[PDB]
Amino acid sequence: MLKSVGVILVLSSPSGTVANKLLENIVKSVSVTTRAARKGEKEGKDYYFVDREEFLRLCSNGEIIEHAEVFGNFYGVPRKNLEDNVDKGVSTLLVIDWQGAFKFMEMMREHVVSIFIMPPSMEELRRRRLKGAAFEISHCEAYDYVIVNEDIEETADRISNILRAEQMKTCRQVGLRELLESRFPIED
Amino acid sequence: SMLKSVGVILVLSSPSTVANKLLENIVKSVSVTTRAARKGEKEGKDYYFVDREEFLRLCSNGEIIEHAEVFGNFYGVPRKNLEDNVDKGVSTLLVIDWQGAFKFMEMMREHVVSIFIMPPSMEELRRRARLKGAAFEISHCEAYDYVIVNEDIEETADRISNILRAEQMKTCRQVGLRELLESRFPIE
Ligand SMILES: Nc1nc2c(ncn2[C@@H]2O[C@H](COP(=O)(O)O)[C@@H](O)[C@H]2O)c(=O)[nH]1
């Protein structure tokens, strides 16, 4: 019977694989960044890698729906197909910092589900600069869900469970009232 | 064990099985009713069976926290251990009608999760004035947090178990989170 509108699934970590696990009805958003590609990273898979001038040009022409400066570099979510996908019932995964999560929760509250991935302790976070991570963590209370990341695989499972639950939310169903009126009509 | 175990009052409704399968960190609640015991049913297991006078006496002295008339008979949820169980991190399963669900959603919004279990069709419902009654109950599913179409009992049980697990990770249900983060991830 019932179709569901997509969710914009926003995941934030400080520590920074799990997303990989999660994707293996959701598509991965690829962000634009001004930072250099690191060993093993590939254009179009990890990020779209551009310079500061091009990043600003893309913002100026409407192609970036969110952006922030994160530890000295720009990062932004491309506008392309996002809202499209929500209408189609396709969810999108965004792995962004708290500034980005806050922006999504403010601008698209009804379609966003936010999850903060917490390290199990500071000592474990250090083993995985930390002042920045502590400040990021202090924004956890604004997120819909929080998960302590002991094991990556378990975290991925719990995120998958949250996504599946959120897809069954009544407020995300399309045409429920019409469905009830047609299939379970009150007579008289 | 950085975050503390969280307890939900899980309200399930259908048109007046799935419950049993879910239970076999949540405990059953046994309701009071004024209807007659049916074949196979046992006091203290299926319901506390009382007469109308005694039911109204239990409502006066505060021992019943919710009550409704459901198809000519009274039903109610005993107050005993519900609030204390939420404090212990222990979830409670309430299998109640829409009047009960609405009451819990208004009385204890922050602790309640409601799920409406829809039959797959009116014919399936009918083979399980009465249909007019069921359609009216069903009309209320728009006010529930979640709606699930019951195609397969076991699938429905797994989906409910998934929703329960997800809701237990909601940030708003962790108590003392801010103080936890301040102690374990201090900003310096
Ligand atoms: N606000 C925002 N943050 C992003 C975006 N893409 C990545 N990030 C965040 O930037 C931080 C640095 O990522 P890294 O440089 O380690 O890949 C991480 O928190 C990551 O989630 C984005 O499009 N917008």
Ligand SMILES: Nc1nc2c(ncn2[C@@H]2O[C@H](COP(=O)(O)O)[C@@H](O)[C@H]2O)c(=O)[nH]1
């Ligand atoms: N409001 C309310 N409904 C209840 C309670 N206990 C059972 N019910 C509901 O009353 C209806 C009739 O239950 P039955 O008589 O078939 O066992 C069902 O929808 C059941 O969920 C209760 O404590 N409160």
